[PDB]
Amino acid sequence: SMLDDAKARLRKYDIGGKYSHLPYNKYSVLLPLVAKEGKLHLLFTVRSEKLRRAPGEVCFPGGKRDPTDMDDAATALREAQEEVGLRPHQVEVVCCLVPCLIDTDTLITPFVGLIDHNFQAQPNPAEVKDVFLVPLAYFLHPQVHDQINHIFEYTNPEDGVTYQIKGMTANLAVLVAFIILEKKPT
Numbered sequence: 684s685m686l687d688d689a690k691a692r693l694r695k696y697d698i699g700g701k702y703s704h705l706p707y708n709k710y711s712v713l714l715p716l717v718a719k720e721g722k723l724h725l726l727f728t729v730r731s732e733k734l735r736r737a738p739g740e741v742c743f744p745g746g747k748r749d750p751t752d753m754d755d756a757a758t759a760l761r762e763a764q765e766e767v768g769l770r771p772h773q774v775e776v777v778c779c780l781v782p783c784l785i786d787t788d789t790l791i792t793p794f795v796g797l798i799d800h801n802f803q804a805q806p807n808p809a810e811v812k813d814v815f816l817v818p819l820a821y822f823l824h825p826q827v828h829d830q831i832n833h834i835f836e837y838t839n840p841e842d843g844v845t846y847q848i849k850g851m852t853a854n855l856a857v858l859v860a861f862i863i864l865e866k867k868p869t
């Protein structure tokens with residue numbers, strides 16, 4: 684099926700705990716996959732205007748590891764719960780993708796998780812201004828604007844609201860789309 688085929692594909696790019704012990708400042712992100720109307724979607728947040736780093740920007744749920752976390756996946760789940768209400772029984776963590784190195788001293792580890800069909804986002808307004816879905820297929824033929832560097836513009840046909848997606852967030856979305864959608868019979 685669609686979901687089982689997505690997980691089998693994702694498991695082949697799983698690096699595991701390989702890079703997890705290295706002595707970095709550590710952050711984790713969740714890439715949440717949602718099935719709606721026969722198709723896979725990614726869930727995104729718009730950061731609150733009040734935040735210190737990157738107010739008003741599109742990003743995945745995530746943040747900094749703390750001493751309670753058993754592992755890097757636990758960081759991602761804890762942060763997703765606190766930002767958009769996502770509970771642990773509502774997410775299956777499928778795999779750990781290649782981490783991102785930033786600023787010489789920081790490592791960001793992304794996890795892909797399948798989200799239960801009955802989940803509804805309760806955004807925390809102190810951290811999250813907005814939550815939205817994008818069809819996974821969009822990342823194969825995006826609408827690109829050059830800022831000189833590449834920015835994606837997505838218009839939700841439900842309400843005509845346009846979002847800008849860029850940087851690490853845009854790169855990870857394209858990656859996940861390639862992994863799951865490349866080479867499929869129609």
Ligand SMILES: COc1cc(C(=O)O)cc(OC)c1OC
Binds near residue numbers: 711745746786791850
């Ligand atoms: C996981 O949080 C981050 C995300 C990004 C980003 O590029 O989206 C940049 C960061 O630092 C420069 C972050 O914290 C270190």
